[PDB]
Design a protein around this ligand. Structure first.
Ligand SMILES: Cc1cc2nc3c(=O)[nH]c(=O)nc-3n(C[C@H](O)[C@H](O)[C@H](O)COP(=O)(O)OP(=O)(O)OC[C@H]3O[C@@H](n4cnc5c(N)ncnc54)[C@H](O)[C@@H]3O)c2cc1C
Ligand SMILES: NC(=O)c1ccc[n+]([C@@H]2O[C@H](COP(=O)([O-])OP(=O)(O)OC[C@H]3O[C@@H](n4cnc5c(N)ncnc54)[C@H](OP(=O)(O)O)[C@@H]3O)[C@@H](O)[C@H]2O)c1
Ligand SMILES: [Mg+2]
Length: 309
């Protein structure tokens, strides 16, 4: 059944923690584990990082941690590095169900010369490689937590939640879905529909697929799961199979759900939002609806939740 979690006093706060730790005095957390999430055919490594904050930096699902990688700011000598934000991929109880760890889902930013393909480690992303290079016992400077856009609306435990992720944008939704389905949270018994759409390059690039597939078998009446494998599938128009093409495959169901009050979440590449808007406008147009008016109503009704980068 659902996994026992502790401490239940993490449910007591009425407001999300915010900026508990700030950049000039971060919390020195400790790495528990780092593991690759992806297989050899993935275009790049995405790693899962479990971070022991000891209960000192609690958060709510949908929030981000800040990480200050070591070193000095290049554009400000003697200054610390800037914060990088990472959507937390764990529930508030974390992957050890004890309120002491949080997890990040981090893609290594690797530079390749556009013409030679030559790598240049000096142009690699500092924090993402710092994180995926981390080992148990290493220290991580944490700030935050931060973010309210992606907090899970729990007022209606039978709400519908349509989650659209690309790549590491899956992070908040791993947290949502563990709280909805995996953890024994007496004060949040989810009985609605959670529908995850996940776009990744190929099968080897899938993130937490075994976990999400397990929800299909455990909660078949409350969870749906669709993947867009961009380098293994192509869309109706011939472009690579992207999440927007998967949304289009279910557009009548999705619009009906939205009309019924469903929340819809977008997390991942900022570049996916224009193609999603184009798809939704085309879908609306075929239904004889104005997408612009629909989106205005969704935003007014606080059904529309976007965090992309
Ligand atoms: C709210 C929020 C949540 C986020 N959640 C996540 C998440 O869950 N997972 C995740 O992986 N990311 C997430 N991101 C992105 C993350 O914050 C970082 O921006 C990302 O990890 C890259 O930071 P970095 O320190 O590795 O790269 P930086 O060192 O900041 O470099 C940025 C980019 O510039 C490139 N670059 C550096 N120098 C050069 C050069 N000389 N020429 C050309 N290119 C260069 C790097 O290769 C890299 O791609 C999130 C962003 C936001 C705003
Ligand atoms: N809270 C946040 O804001 C937050 C949280 C987590 C992640 N992020 C951001 O999310 C991004 C995730 O990048 P990643 O490296 O994990 O993913 P990625 O591998 O670059 O892309 C993931 C999938 O999205 C596809 N894709 C590319 N362009 C697209 C488009 N216009 N529309 C739809 N799909 C498209 C890719 O296909 P192809 O590569 O085959 O084209 C791939 O299949 C990062 O930029 C990160 O900063 C933001
Ligand atoms: Mg895999």
């Amino acid at each position: 059944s659902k996994v026992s979690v502790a401490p239940l006093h993490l449910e007591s706060a009425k407001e999300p923690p915010l900026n508990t730790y700030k950049p000039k005095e971060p919390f020195t957390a400790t790495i528990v584990s780092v593991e690759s999430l992806v297989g050899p055919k993935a275009p790049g490594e995405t790693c899962h990082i479990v971070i022991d904050h000891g209960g000192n930096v609690p958060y709510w699902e949908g929030q981000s941690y800040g990480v200050i990688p070591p070193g000095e700011n290049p554009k400000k000598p003697g200054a610390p590095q800037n914060v990088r934000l990472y959507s937390i991929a764990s529930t508030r109880y974390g992957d050890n169900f004890d309120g002491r760890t949080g997890s990040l889902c981090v893609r290594r930013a690797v530079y390749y010369d556009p013409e030679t393909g030559k790598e240049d480690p000096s142009k690699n992303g500092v924090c993402s490689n710092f994180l995926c290079n981390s080992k148990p016992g290493d220290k991580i400077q944490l700030t935050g937590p931060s973010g309210k856009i992606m907090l899970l609306p729990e007022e209606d435990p039978n709400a519908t939640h349509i989650m659209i992720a690309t790549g590491t944008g899956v992070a908040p939704f791993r947290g949502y879905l563990r709280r909805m389905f995996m953890e024994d949270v007496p004060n949040y018994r989810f009985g609605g529909l959670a529908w995850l759409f996940l776009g990744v390059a190929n099968s080897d690039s899938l993130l937490y697929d075994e976990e999400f597939t397990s929800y299909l078998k455990q909660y078949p009446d409350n969870f749906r799961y669709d993947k867009a494998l961009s380098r293994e599938q192509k869309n109706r128009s011939g472009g690579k199979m992207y999440v927007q093409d998967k949304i289009e495959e279910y557009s009548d169901e999705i619009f009906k759900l939205l009309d019924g009050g469903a929340h819809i979440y977008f997390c991942g590449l900022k570049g996916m939002m224009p193609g999603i808007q184009d798809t939704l406008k085309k879908v609306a147009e075929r239904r004889g609806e104005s997408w612009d008016q629909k989106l205005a109503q969704l935003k007014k009704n606080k059904q529309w939740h976007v965090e992309v980068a």
